[PDB]
Ligand binder design. Structure first.
Ligand SMILES: Cc1cc2ncn([C@H]3O[C@H](COP(=O)(O)O)[C@@H](O)[C@H]3O)c2cc1C
Ligand SMILES: Cc1cc2ncn([C@H]3O[C@H](COP(=O)(O)O)[C@@H](O)[C@H]3O)c2cc1C
Ligand SMILES: O=C(O)c1cccnc1
Ligand SMILES: O=C(O)c1cccnc1
Lengths: 346, 346
């Protein structure tokens, strides 16, 4: 793990310079394609991409797990929905499934801690049947967090070996916006009231309790904001840790990762805290409708491309942004050149 | 034309209610897919779509034309670039071409007034070789505007007959951000300084002249803000009128139209002024980096989905948003149902 972290490659400035020069000579006024241009250059700098903005196979990894904090009345959906939805993932009827098929990406459902019997078709990496209730103690042990980070990391890079060049991250876990809000509060220094949202339609009257739960979690655990692994283990969850692991793994592999929504922002904060070298590999997707979204993004210094008022999770926003990434590649490789048209601009 | 305007269909509230009900029962917390849900319902209400969110063939119509106002020093690119780029459109090397191919849409290049010899492969609907310099008079006659609106309108609907269900609108015309800014100022009541941008990299020092040009255009022509056709003819251009015609034509055909950037906003304002019934058929794409973008969008009451800092035009932003439209359809038709999973949420 320390090894893994040590081995994350820095971006290729040379490839990026070459990329920038090419883009400037394309059939358009310079810089006119805006973020589509900056995205291509960012991609060019990723060592796993071979010096150019390229997209091979795509995969969305969905990390599923239950949380003990559910018992605190912070979620309106029955606990079983995690298990139910996880099986549905295997049938291609879910939101991420539909959107992924649309983008030509494959969905990988991973069980990191669902509180139910094992589901056939789902990759088994279960840590335990649900994590501990953060309100009264820690979600898990440090050891547990570390081992899962490692395991997911390797799984992520192994995919690279099979042609995957673009990843998307997602989750499934009733009550997960609670630990997400806690982490956000911790890493960001924001008060719980400011980053606690409605999650999956929590009634406005139940909010206050959710806020109390977050503060309690923090107070009791005393997580260290300067230690990403400490925070994850204490007030995180298996699903959030898994998402963080995807991030570490893509980075180590020198490949890009598309974030999703609020839960993913949580995970991204942790990843970046753990290894700043991870940052350059991250790509925002959409601007989640969760209250704490603005604050989290500001701390990541990220401006998402899509404003869809989305708040489903599952990696649905990540799937939706995949075509944008492919567009930046299409622009780069298939547009003609000014010179070839004898076009001269000041 | 009055006929045409009269015959624009109102949206199907019945189909929309049915759509809403279906969406609510899908495998997710209600309303969780945000704008993706509102988009599907909007589509369902369009009579040309047959009571459901559907996407058949896609086409982007690019309206090309030169402007006399170029002579005022409001554009840094040589005049010939319009003609040059228009031919390139026929070779598939341009920005819209690349992005359209990416989205599986076909590009239709239409010459509505390029100041050069006719270009083989380009649809000929040329009004004149460039429009009049708005700084000293009108761009064209009312008759001319009306005839072009009509002609483009019919062409647009005819495509519908050939399987096209989704349109995108675009343009090509050096100096076109000038008449665009003028129209915006007129329809919106904003001062020229507030809506005049850098267009295709106009140097910050040249701005002031561009602003003076806009005011002069307005002062001299005295366009009537309550008469969209009056405004277009006076301080518009053949390209902008053509874009407006696409809009009128899709609406008459009861089909959706994706806007592009700043130039398209101009055209949309005019279209809506001319026929409010057009509004429900319009779909924003991206948030153009042109200064006057915020003001124009506010007047259309539109919030774009994409924030890419784009400012190329050609209908490139429209092509980029096509997959989003297709996603809303995919969601609608392929997601599973809560009921089928025995999932019950309050
Ligand atoms: C049917 C259904 C499908 C979902 N897919 C993702 N979520 C989302 O809702 C949960 C977070 O919200 P909270 O913290 O309020 O539980 C996670 O499962 C998240 O993925 C879903 C939720 C439901 C009910
Ligand atoms: C090579 C080239 C390709 C383009 N494609 C679109 N535009 C854009 O630039 C023009 C508007 O900017 P202004 O008002 O400053 O001229 C239009 O042609 C618009 O389509 C282009 C401009 C250039 C130079
Ligand atoms: O932003 C998300 O991904 C999200 C928000 C609320 C509930 N589930 C997921
Ligand atoms: O927003 C646009 O479409 C645009 C902006 C500047 C120049 N050309 C096009």
């Amino acid at each position: 793990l320390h090894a893994l972290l040590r081995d994350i490659p820095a971006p290729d400035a040379e490839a990026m310079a070459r990329t920038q020069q090419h883009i400037d000579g394309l059939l358009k006024p310079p810089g006119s394609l805006g973020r589509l241009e900056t995205l291509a250059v960012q991609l060019a700098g990723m060592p796993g991409l071979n010096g150019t903005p390229q997209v091979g196979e795509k995969a969305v990894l969905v990390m599923c797990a239950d949380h003990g904090v559910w018992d605190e009345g912070v979620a309106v959906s029955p606990k079983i929905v995690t298990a139910i939805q996880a099986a549905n993932m295997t049938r291609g009827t879910t939101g991420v499934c539909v959107l992924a098929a649309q983008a030509g990406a494959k969905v990988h459902v991973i069980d990191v801690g669902i509180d139910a019997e094992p589901i056939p078709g789902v990759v088994n990496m279960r840590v335990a049947r649900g994590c501990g209730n953060i309100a009264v103690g820690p979600a898990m042990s440090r050891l547990q967090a570390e081992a899962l980070l490692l395991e997911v990391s390797r799984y992520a890079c192994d995919l690279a070996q099979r042609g995957v060049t673009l990843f998307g991250v997602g989750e499934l876990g009733m009550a997960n916006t609670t630990p997400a809000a806690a982490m956000v509060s911790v890493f960001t220094g924001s008060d719980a009231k400011e980053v606690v949202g409605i999650g999956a339609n929590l009634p406005p009257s139940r909010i206050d309790n959710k806020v109390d739960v977050v503060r309690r979690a923090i107070a009791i655990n005393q997580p260290n904001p300067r230690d990403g692994i400490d925070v994850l283990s204490k007030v995180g969850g298996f699903d959030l840790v898994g998402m963080t692991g995807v991030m570490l793994g893509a980075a180590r592999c020198g490949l890009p990762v598309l974030l999703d929504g609020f839960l993913s922002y949580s995970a991204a904060l942790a990843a970046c805290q753990i290894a700043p070298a991870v940052r350059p590999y991250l790509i925002p997707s959409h601007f989640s409708a969760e209250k704490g979204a603005r604050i989290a993004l500001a701390h990541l210094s990220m401006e998402p491309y899509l404003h869809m008022a989305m708040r489903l999770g599952e990696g649905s926003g990540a799937a939706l942004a995949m075509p944008i990434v492919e567009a930046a590649c299409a622009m780069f490789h298939n547009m003609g050149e000014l010179a070839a048209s004898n076009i001269v601009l000041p």
